[model samples]
Target: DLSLSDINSTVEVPEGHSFWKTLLAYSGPGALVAVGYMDPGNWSTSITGGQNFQYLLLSIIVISSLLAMLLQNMAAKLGIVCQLDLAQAIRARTSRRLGFIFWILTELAIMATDIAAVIGAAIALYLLFKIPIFLAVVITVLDVFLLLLLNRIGFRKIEALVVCLIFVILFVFLYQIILSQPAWHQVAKGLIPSWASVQTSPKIGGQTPLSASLGIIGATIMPHNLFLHSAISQSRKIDRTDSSKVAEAVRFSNWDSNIQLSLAMVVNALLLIMGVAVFKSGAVQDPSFFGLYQALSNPDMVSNPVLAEAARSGVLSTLFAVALLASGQNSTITGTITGQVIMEGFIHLRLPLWLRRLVTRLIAIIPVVVCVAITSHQGSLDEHQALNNLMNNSQVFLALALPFSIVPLLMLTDSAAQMGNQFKNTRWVKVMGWLTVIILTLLNLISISSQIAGFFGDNPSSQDLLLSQVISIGIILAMIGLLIWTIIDIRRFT
Candidate 1:
């Protein structure tokens, strides 16, 4: 109840007399949820995966999106049944130190998202308008007030604008996808997992390297969106006191979420498909949005016969930047809202909307610049290329912090002590939840392993090696501490 009191119960659902209106009322939060899935992180990972593995990793996209749908459904149910957002639910059950650390995990995750938001729109501005890097950052900063204006008008207004922009991305990619004219049979084959994609590496060590597959997982099934959906689902007017009313809200909210998440899944797949079509897939090096934008405009990069003609005429690249522009702007709105949710939900401070929103943006902007600065500092690369490096590396934070956010959700939602039997996940849901938890944690461990390798592997004369090891060690240390704490805490259920 304390999470978003201003907008909580703000949208009154129709008397359940009309299905469509009720469904529509429950619709907007998923748009917010969906943004994280397709943001700059996903673009980097999806296109990277598509390029290197072509459709080999397509199965991973399908799997990741399915997991997102399940996890987000659980998150929405937690809101209805526990009557609190995930942060608040965790806050109520933990010691001050434990909650504070948990807050750090969430804080950084949202900021990681904020990093994506700021960098994304800035890249688009520069790509289309050739806005200079510093000015692009400042221009994006000015939109904070525009976001402020959007908030005051109506929460639904926020969703309306998000859905519109997402369509612009969706359609743009679909257009490229059709023009790419990928082999339908091969695309279909890629959707089915194989020994090649899931098992060993023609790409990595003995196993599939973390970046190829795990980045796809981290990008597609983000941490903040869980915090996001649980909080925003409350924005709808529902009778929390009545079981059926809460149940109805939960049901339609899932439909809305699944549909939007499904849209993101398609876009992610198309991103991969279009990557292979345009670049003929894979890089000996990591990919960048700036790199991709350049590739799109150069007719020589379009290898596919069907798409080559479009690039020959010079329209495809413009469309690519246009869609990216739409995606960047769309993600900024969600990033701002989720920032508010995490701040209020974790800290339980009631601040004015403008104050809270401004606080989130200010905190986010410094790090956004620092990330760009650090990457550029590491190498004298193009300023635009620096943005991509930061982006690829930022997913490291999301991947690093992901388990911290998700593990708590699985434990809290599964236990009747918190959600009670009616709301608690059924045995099957519990099984799948634990399964995903194990799979995700194992994947992260491998990601951690290779991440440390990249230090010596990518740089050495520089302190980048030390810095990289330090981050891995710190994440591992946190993981150990969280593990002991979680094991001790979950035993209360036994």
Candidate 2:
């Protein structure tokens, strides 16, 4: 049990207890995993989805949440029954070279995850206190110490704190959505994806609705959550030898994941609904975390009389900042743990937990700090469009890296030899798993291609335009080749 190292069997699961008691024992991990789903990384995409397309993209949220439930259950069951986190199981089953490659990909995914949390926390600090973006980024690094303190308090307390923060965000958005006065009928219609809803429309700047749809999917089904869930699921002590006990753990863990993720879905949906209800008419382009916060109270941007009144009170903006801060801080806790799990499991490189936290935070911070410093020096860093671009690019990287974690999890859990007959995936489960993998892979490819095209298609100097186009084509071909290789190699394992 590499996943259970310090926390192994630390939480006691009482036998012969009432169902409520048993479920409570397994509650914390799902809350932690759910934190990733509704992190600050999801805020902009969700808000923009609603603001741009109104309720049309709500179907993606529902689909992504359902997919999360399926994948998270597989991840938790893999840990409870196999006694191995996804990374450990993956490393064990692969060759040394493949393990090294997987480690690199997963590590990149963790960095991408941290980038969002770090940038989000930084932006929150700026929104709340008007701190410089660079200073705010530096301040976010202090959250590692906050994590260390929570670790001292114990793992259950960390879960409690995360769940509390989730409630804070949920309530904050609920109140805002109510004040914004969303159209209930449109919200309902958004949940059922229609042809027009899913149609690929090109925006003014060559961006497509398809790309935004992919971002929603990416933001929802986080790759790090797969690793985090597998590790945290082992925090509860389970009788591995007892088939009945193992089955019980799996059932309850899935219940916890689904229920908590359902909450995450609502938070995300509210984000979109609020976006549509409030900012849609303002013609706000790609609302950043800060943009959303400012829009909450900016009388000029918010047209609704009730919302404008609430904004003038200043309470709405403050609540938005507070919720954004909670989201950033909560997501970082899981990001730190997932980084540790990937390092220890995939590469067998163990460090002190505090050291790992600092190292990962520093690695994530350096790029952000440098970017912030450079852009600020150039007088562009304070712009919401620039900040939003950075955050969205980080998310795209996560989307591109997703199949590395997901395809393997699907393969491992579906394999009879890997999971044993009792816990192995059913046929329909395997089919659905493969379908998820395919859909995510396709989405990532489309997103990447669109990003490349958008970059070169943007106004370019005549001198470098030809070179940039050639370079873009080369990168796209290389990406396609690597994607094909990954698909073939993963299937080979199955």
Candidate 3:
């Protein structure tokens, strides 16, 4: 209940206003939630998806966005109906031991999310201001002060800033996409699922299309967003005891989520398209934010005359870095708030806002700083690619932790006993929710299997290779068993 209690009903809706005006009151939370979809973590996956496979992975983005719409709607409804965010709801139904275990899983997931944001912002600083990556990362630790300032201005201002940053990202890509002049027919074709082409496409850094697809799904439908959405939906004052008011809140929040996420989907598509248009010919070794910026400026790296001209003018790279910095800052804000919500809801533990922000920021920074330090000694190009790879891989952790948050959200929202007659999911919603969970679970398993196989595949010794395969199989089976146990445990509440 403490999730949004402080800010709850702080944004007032004029009762007699038109529907659009009423929706404006519920609009801000969705923008905050949408930030996760277009964060720094998503950039590498999406750009690489397009760079290696052309427009083939656009289908994945379409599917991921649709799934996100369904899950976020359910998340918002769960909060409105049950008066609890996802973590709180799960904790309420489980024993302390079970809840603590769930808390650990969710905390790891949050850290995974923070990893991407931290790497992104730090790299952005390096790209934009010529700051060293290590120093930039240390400087990012001070983003807590930015959060403190935004908090003083109130939650609505925070939402406005996030939305503005989102537009900064959106328009930046929109312009780049236009300049790229992609083949319209191919772009249209990409929206249709062609599983074969996606699988057969050229690999980036030995990463198969399956791995890229997993990253796209993971980055797009984030676990943290579900928790964040459920908590932020409560910011609008609604009389939860009144069935009509709760229903109204759900309706407006769903509207807000869909609209913002649709915009996010467009931005994601633009990113992928920009990647394809610029690097589909395999001009870059590893397509990353830095690589993309440099490609825009160097005629030798990119063959496109228009893009090269823009690059030579020096504006394209600068704009790309600016957009990237905006993306990094936006994601950090949401990640910090989500961490606070998860900690409070799971453990019923509270800290001063500043202290909590600092703790989470520091936790996210340490591994990134260590990675940068280790890689920096190798050489600059190696360090850059390593950092990008690290950010990209962090998303797989998000994918791994996704089912933990998603399965519970689906179960809690579908339960007639929990939601009462007015709020339980419809038959179609139930079908889709379960289907989403099943598909994502399968994808996670496949991605994990591939990663493990590749890790051991690198060893030349036949005995080590055999051992790796054996260990991989055992780990995968254990993951499957754990997933089944989680589902069965969640069913208890239903």
Candidate 4:
């Protein structure tokens, strides 16, 4: 038998609990959450990133994943030490009115993430069947019912179902990567961390396309994730007071998070590599183009007639749609959980899961209905063209909203009081967190500014420029003020 010191001190280990087993046991929650990292929105954005930027945006994925891991650790620590869900903790500290406002904003952020997933799924449906996009949105209402049904079976069963779907996505892409047979040298270069590899500017077919940089930024860091992860971490109960157990749990959780996140990164990278191999090499120009569809309808794109027959009905396209359907459903579960936590935390309002699902589902579906109706009204455009427009434009919405959601959370997570003493974020971690927030904020601002400028067509008049600058400066000033106040508050508490 081991000495009492060995059992009670830092060297202590529970009977039958080895390092590997503890690590694996703690891995599930992170792996479960990591699915969101490689969802349909991510797939669409990552492929577009590769198609446009080549390997330049590869660095962004590396950086984003690392930063996300740090943020997630903070959230996990919050759940483990404070014994409060993120929303509840924030509520306990802030004034009632302020908490209410934060709750609403967080809820909006969660809904926005869910909306992207749902829309991605609808696009997949359009590709899979001759089904209308609006109908696909309506079909997603079944997700809530499905969740309730799965609960009756078992929670682990639902996790298994999600894992199985994820595997299907993973295996298909891996196979594609093998068949594409990309140059390993180029992929290695892409993975290296450097500012220059931020965006791709390759010339394709004599046309100089701007780097597919925008989507890469938006895709790698969806804002809803912070809310989702914090809430999900609550699922696992841990003893906060016993520092040793807390440390052990944190170590196990980090391993779980790192492994799961790495798998997600690999899957996304494979999607990018596959795009480079099959779609990029084909010189197909734009996958969204009707010309490509017409070409696909021809017997030449693939030589097999049976395959060609299947292609006409869009069976080839349906593969992505099915993935999107899975992505959207998985994301919806996270969204419902997040909404419940945020509401309860900020205002002491505990909504039933069913009501939360209904509210979120209806809100998400509204945009799909409006966009589909408008596309239908504009009968001049082809069906594929309309759907393509929605897919490509989602980045615009994500780009605008991502920063608004990201900055506040980053600020909160980095606070010492919020995270407590469990996981000491090193200097490097704090720097990286700030750097990510800055880049995301700038990217979102530029996207919104560019969109506004493009909408107005010509350059604005002096008055318009003045007004815009004023609004912009005011917003910046407000942010600066918030930052100063947050810092001072931290010092006061310390």
lDDT of each: 0.73, 0.76, 0.76, 0.59
Clashing pairs in model 2, backbone N/Cα/C closer than 3 A: none
Ranking by TM-score: 3, 2, 1, 4
Q: Kindly list the per-residue Cα lDDT of model 1 for residues 1-494, writing each as its tens digit.
A: 47667777776766756878778776888887886677765676666666667688888889889988988899888776766788887767666667677667766777766777778778778788988766677788776677667767676777877788878888988888777767889899998976576555466322253446665665446778888888887787776677777777777888999999999898888888877665654431435667777677666677777666676776776787787777767545666566666666766655555765466667767766775677558663666655665555555666666776778889998888988778788899889888987778767765775556553445564667667777787877778788668656655653
What tens digits encode model 3's per-residue C-alpha lDDT throughout 1-494? 46866776677584753779888767898999987778766676677667777788888888889999999889888877776788888878766665676677677777777777778778778888989878998988888788777678877678888889889989988887787777989999989987754574466657677767666665447788888899888787776776766777787899999999998999889878877886546666555667777876776655478877877888777888888788778655676677777778888877666886687778878778777778776665477777766665555556566777888888888888788877899999989889988887777766665555554434567777677678767866876665677667778766
Compute each candidate's TM-score over C-alphas. Answer: 0.90, 0.91, 0.92, 0.80
Candidates 1 and 3 compared: the better one by TM-score is 3
For residue 279, model 1's alpha carbon misses the true position, in angstroms, by 3.1
lDDT of 4 at 440: 66
| Number of backbone collisions per candidate | 1, 0, 0, 5
lDDT of 2 by residue, 361-467 (tens): 89888878777767777886455566666665666567556777787788888877788877899999889988887787777755665555455435766866666
Ten residues in a row with the worst lDDT in model 3? 450-459
Runs in model 4 deviating more than 4 A are: 1-16, 194-220, 281-315, 380-422, 451-494
Point out the worst 10-residue segment of candidate 2 by lDDT. Answer: 198-207
RMSD of each: 3.1, 2.7, 2.6, 6.5
Question: Tens digit of lDDT per residue, candidate 4, span 220-251?
Answer: 46555555556555555554667777777777
